[PDB]
Amino acid sequence: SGFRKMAFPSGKVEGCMVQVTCGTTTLNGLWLDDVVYCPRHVICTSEDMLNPNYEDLLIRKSNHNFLVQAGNVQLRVIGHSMQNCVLKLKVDTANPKTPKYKFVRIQPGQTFSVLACYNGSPSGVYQCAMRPNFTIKGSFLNGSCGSVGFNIDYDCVSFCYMHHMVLPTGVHAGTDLEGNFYGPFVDRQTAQAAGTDTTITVNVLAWLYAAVINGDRWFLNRFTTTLNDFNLVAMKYNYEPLTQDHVDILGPLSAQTGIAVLDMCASLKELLQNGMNGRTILGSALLEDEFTPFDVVRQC
Amino acid sequence: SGFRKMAFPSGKVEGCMVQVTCGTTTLNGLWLDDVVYCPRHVICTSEDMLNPNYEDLLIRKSNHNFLVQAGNVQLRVIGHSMQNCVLKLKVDTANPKTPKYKFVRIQPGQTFSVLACYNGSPSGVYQCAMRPNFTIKGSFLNGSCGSVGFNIDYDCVSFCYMHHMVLPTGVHAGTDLEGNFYGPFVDRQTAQAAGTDTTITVNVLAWLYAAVINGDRWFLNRFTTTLNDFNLVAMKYNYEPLTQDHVDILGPLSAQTGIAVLDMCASLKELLQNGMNGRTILGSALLEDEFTPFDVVRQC
Ligand SMILES: Cn1cc(-c2cc(-c3cc(Cl)c(F)c(OCc4ccccc4Cl)c3)c(=O)n(-c3cccnc3)c2)c(=O)[nH]c1=O
Numbered sequence: 366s367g368f369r370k371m372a373f374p375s376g377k378v379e380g381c382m383v384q385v386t387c388g389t390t391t392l393n394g395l396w397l398d399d400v401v402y403c404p405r406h407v408i409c410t411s412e413d414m415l416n417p418n419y420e421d422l423l424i425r426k427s428n429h430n431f432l433v434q435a436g437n438v439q440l441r442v443i444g445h446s447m448q449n450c451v452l453k454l455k456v457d458t459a460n461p462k463t464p465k466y467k468f469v470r471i472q473p474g475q476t477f478s479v480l481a482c483y484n485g486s487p488s489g490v491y492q493c494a495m496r497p498n499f500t501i502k503g504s505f506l507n508g509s510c511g512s513v514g515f516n517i518d519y520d521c522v523s524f525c526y527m528h529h530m531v532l533p534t535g536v537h538a539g540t541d542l543e544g545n546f547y548g549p550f551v552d553r554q555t556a557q558a559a560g561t562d563t564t565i566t567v568n569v570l571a572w573l574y575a576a577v578i579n580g581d582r583w584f585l586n587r588f589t590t591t592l593n594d595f596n597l598v599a600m601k602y603n604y605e606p607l608t609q610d611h612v613d614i615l616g617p618l619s620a621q622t623g624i625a626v627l628d629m630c631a632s633l634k635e636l637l638q639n640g641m642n643g644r645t646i647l648g649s650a651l652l653e654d655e656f657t658p659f660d661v662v663r664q665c
Numbered sequence: 666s667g668f669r670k671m672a673f674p675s676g677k678v679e680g681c682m683v684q685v686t687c688g689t690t691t692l693n694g695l696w697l698d699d700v701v702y703c704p705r706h707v708i709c710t711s712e713d714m715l716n717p718n719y720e721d722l723l724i725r726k727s728n729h730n731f732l733v734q735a736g737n738v739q740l741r742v743i744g745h746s747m748q749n750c751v752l753k754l755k756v757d758t759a760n761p762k763t764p765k766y767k768f769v770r771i772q773p774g775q776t777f778s779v780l781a782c783y784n785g786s787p788s789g790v791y792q793c794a795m796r797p798n799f800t801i802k803g804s805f806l807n808g809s810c811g812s813v814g815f816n817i818d819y820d821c822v823s824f825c826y827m828h829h830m831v832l833p834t835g836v837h838a839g840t841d842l843e844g845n846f847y848g849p850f851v852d853r854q855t856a857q858a859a860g861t862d863t864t865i866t867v868n869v870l871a872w873l874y875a876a877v878i879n880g881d882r883w884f885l886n887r888f889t890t891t892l893n894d895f896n897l898v899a900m901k902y903n904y905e906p907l908t909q910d911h912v913d914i915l916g917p918l919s920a921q922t923g924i925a926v927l928d929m930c931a932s933l934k935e936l937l938q939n940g941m942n943g944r945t946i947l948g949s950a951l952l953e954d955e956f957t958p959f960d961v962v963r964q965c
Pocket residue numbers: 389390391392406414505506507508509510529530531532533551552553554555556557666
């Protein structure tokens with residue numbers, strides 16, 4: 366009963382967030398085992414951020430120039446390296462609160478949980494998705510850099526995101542914990558376009574099955590449709606094409622609800638073609654798409 | 666840059682959530698110092714929930730009939746009592762992870778953070794508000810009972826809510842950690858109406874100032890208005906009347922934005938009187954009202 370944008374419980378990840386200070390720049394880092402991950406532009410200066418040669422900058426730097434503070438206790442840096450666009454600071458201590466963790470690289474449409482941080486101190490948590498153009502619509506201010514995205518399968522925290530920068534368009538970009546940017550984005554202050562953002566078609570169909578479970582059934586109709594016909598409508602409107610894989614994913618939701626997936630697609634088409642007429646589906650005058658089929662089952 | 670429904674970081678409260686089993690009924694509890702709080706209908710049975718005499722039931726029960734499990738470790742109950750609609754189980758141990766905490770009773774419109782639990786294990790976290798009719802629109806399934814609502818001022822966790830029941834209308838009701846229900850609700854399965862739910866007028870004005878900070882300024886106009894005239898419009902539409910207190914609260918947001926509060930009210934009236942014409946304010950085709958003026962400053 367009820368449906369909300371829930372976020373994974375953030376306890377495990379709070380215990381890994383540290384402050385990382387280089388020169389005058391300060392930003393958050395992730396402390397797992399005896400290594401501290403943080404964005405590499407920590408080492409950039411005002412002038413260098415137009416186009417930095419990170420090798421040149423990383424080279425003039427030494428371990429004592431990196432100041433890592435775990436809450437109110439300083440860690441000793443004894444090794445530094447650069448994997449893609451992240452710094453990896455070896456430290457003398459192993460975090461006693463290291464959970465079971467993993468570094469996964471996720472796919473556009475998958476949702477994760479963000480623990481927004483400033484000076485290594487938790488501030489808030491929220492759920493969001495990886496847009497198909499590999500940007501995210503988050504909540505980030507100066508110092509938010511280094512904040513992590515993560516999923517918790519049970520006792521294992523799968524880290525998928527590290528925040529780096531806002532684009533001039535107010536959208537954010539980041540890397541995986543190996544340092545690979547999601548998208549065609551680089552960590553220099555130069556012209557970078559986001560690209561065409563479509564809707565996560567499968568996540569909307571998952572969010573509609575959630576509504577039939579919770580009482581909102583007004584959007585249902587007596588029509589049906591073909592996979593091909595729907596996508597033609599999902600192209601006029603900018604919707605990610607729906608595939609057979611996507612239909613198998615939604616199978617569990619169809620068996621619960623007794624509604625063929627292609628019958629849900631038929632109602633989505635009418636919602637696209639005719640709008641909502643000022644109505645509401647779980648308190649949203651817009652069709653939400655940041656709920657994965659798995660999310661809806663997780664939350665039931 | 667960006668604005669989202671953030672929730673307080675949930676680490677501190679996760680460490681207080683325990684499982685509480687009585688008879689066949691199981692539900693979550695809150696373990697602070699050497700006491701375990703949980704809803705009292707833990708002691709009810711199928712038949713008794715029509716109208717239970719909690720004294721009668723509480724009386725036939727003894728300390729060993731209450732089973733408290735902190736994760737995977739059992740606590741010994743050595744005292745039981747009933748404060749309003751909550752059970753208070755004295756235990757031999759004092760939770761090593763008790764934070765600085767407080768029991769506040771909040772007012773309709775104030776927002777808090779929920780840590781939804783089942784069998785005393787965190788599942789997810791989300792932000793929500795106390796509707797003016799003292800109900801909440803949350804995310805709760807069977808076993809969600811005992812989950813807590815809380816605000817974190819800095820290092821002090823102010824507990825304000827404990828979940829008890831869903832109403833037949835899909836809305837939830839709860840108590841404060843002293844056991845007083847928010848609203849005219851009782852903990853028996855009988856006819857209880859929610860009441861007229863209005864919109865938190867001040868929280869919308871706080872959410873509109875947030876939009877001017879983040880780039881969405883299309884809803885602004887060259888009009889003004891009087892406090893009285895607006896409320897007349899806030900009565901036709903079901904909006905909590907706006908008071909001078911409410912205007913002083915929004916003062917900080919007006920000094921940041923250079924927009925008189927009564928000029929924001931003038932745009933809200935047009936948004937009410939003329940709708941949004943399919944537009945968007947921070948990605949919401951509806952006027953959101955679960956952001957307190959303080960929330961918007963917290964998140965900036
Ligand atoms: C010195 N310094 C800097 C930062 C810091 C750096 C950045 C930042 C980092 C890199 Cl590599 C950039 F290429 C960059 O240009 C992105 C860009 C490209 C093209 C047009 C416009 C733009 Cl904006 C920006 C940032 O985006 N943010 C931020 C701010 C607000 C919300 N989210 C992220 C913050 C910091 O946190 N601490 C600290 O000391």
